[PDB]
Amino acid sequence: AGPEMVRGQVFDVGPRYTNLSYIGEGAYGMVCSAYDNLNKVRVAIKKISPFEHQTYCQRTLREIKILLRFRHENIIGINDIIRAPTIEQMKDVYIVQDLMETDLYKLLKTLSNDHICYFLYQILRGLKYIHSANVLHRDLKPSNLLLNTTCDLKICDFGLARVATEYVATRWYRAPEIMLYTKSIDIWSVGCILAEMLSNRPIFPGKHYLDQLNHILGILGSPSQEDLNCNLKARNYLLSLPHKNKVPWNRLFPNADSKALDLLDKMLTFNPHKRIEVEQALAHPYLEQYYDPPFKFDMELDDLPKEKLKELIFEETARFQPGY
């Protein structure tokens, strides 16, 4: 008679959303599929309970503000947000989004050139929109790329995004300039995704911030001295390691399109300034088939108390009030 429940958890999504079933875990709570009785569509609903860790309030609020402003078919949107009518009763927040049947982290365990071409095209196209907002995503990876039955890709998880040192589970896709940022960070990640779409494994996994580096230097070998010149302690750590050389791209990927290795090569450039930009990557011959034609001082609450963040979250979620 009371609110619906899944796996012993309250999913108090009122009467508008019914027929709840578990579909996995988000960062800060459970994710369920549901039926939107008003718009007659199935949705995904993320339960988020962040109000007792300032970093979880921070990323939740940030992601909401970004997603409520972005509008693009390769970026997940927020259809609705459910929370209590009064701030003091608001312990939970439910974010309602289009139902995507899987993410790319799951999909690469069950690809094709035609598919990789389209996915990569959609990722870059979506990133084109993101960079064009002068936002840095700073967290791209296959699990943040939702996919539906009709081969449509959407980017999600904008918790750690900033306008033009934070723990993350398997921060493998973090760029190397991060070990000492700019939009180059995302192109690096995008490159690491193209690498994994082709090989169904992450060819840069380090059990530690040190092991990571060595997993990179085994492929693009050591860098130019003009790269060491481009943090004192950092460059010295690089000068202390035994030398290693570069590996041709068709050695690790002897089944990959040379067009892909060409574009892949231009994205996995160690130098963050020689690294190709998104709009040049879409223009690459590999994605020729689909080749057709600001916050600024905002989001700036990198350090606010968890109480005022609960205030801003309340304010930002007011555009969906009252619910059905």
Dihedral of CA 5/7/10/15: which sign? negative
**How far is residue 11's CA from residue 94's CA, in Å, rounded to a whole number?**
8
What method did the depositors use to determine the structure? Answer: X-ray
Q: Three-class SS of residue 10?
A: strand
Run of H or E including 197:
helix 184-199
DSSP 41-69: EEEEEEEE--TTSHHHHHHHHHHHHHHHH
**How far is residue 268's CA from residue 219's CA, in Å, rounded to a whole number?**
10
Closest to 79 in 3D by CA, of 122, 119, 136, 39: 39
DSSP state of 256: S
Cis bond leading into 15, ω under 30°? Answer: no
Known catalytic residues are 139
**How far is residue 174's CA from residue 272's CA, in Å, rounded to a whole number?**
12
Contact 34, 46 (CB under 8 A): no
Q: Three-class SS of residue 36?
A: strand
**How far is residue 239's CA from residue 179's CA, in Å, rounded to a whole number?**
14
**How far is residue 295's CA from residue 124's CA, in Å, rounded to a whole number?**
21
Q: With breaks defined as C to next N over 2.5 Å, after which residues does the chain break?
A: 110, 164, 180, 230, 293
> What was the resolution (in A) of this experimentally determined structure?
2.1
Q: Three-class SS of residue 81?
A: strand
Contact 63, 46 (CB under 8 A): no
Beta bridge partners of 45: 32, 96
**What's the CATH number where 262 sits?**
1.10.510.10
**Known binding-site positions for ATP:** 23-31, 46
**How far is residue 60's CA from residue 94's CA, in Å, rounded to a whole number?**
11
| Helix axes 113-132 and 258-267, enclosed angle (nearest 10) | 30
The backbone torsions φ and ψ at residue 23, rounded to the nearest 5 degrees and listed phi first, read: -135, -5
Which residue range is the domain that position 214 belongs to? Answer: 102-287
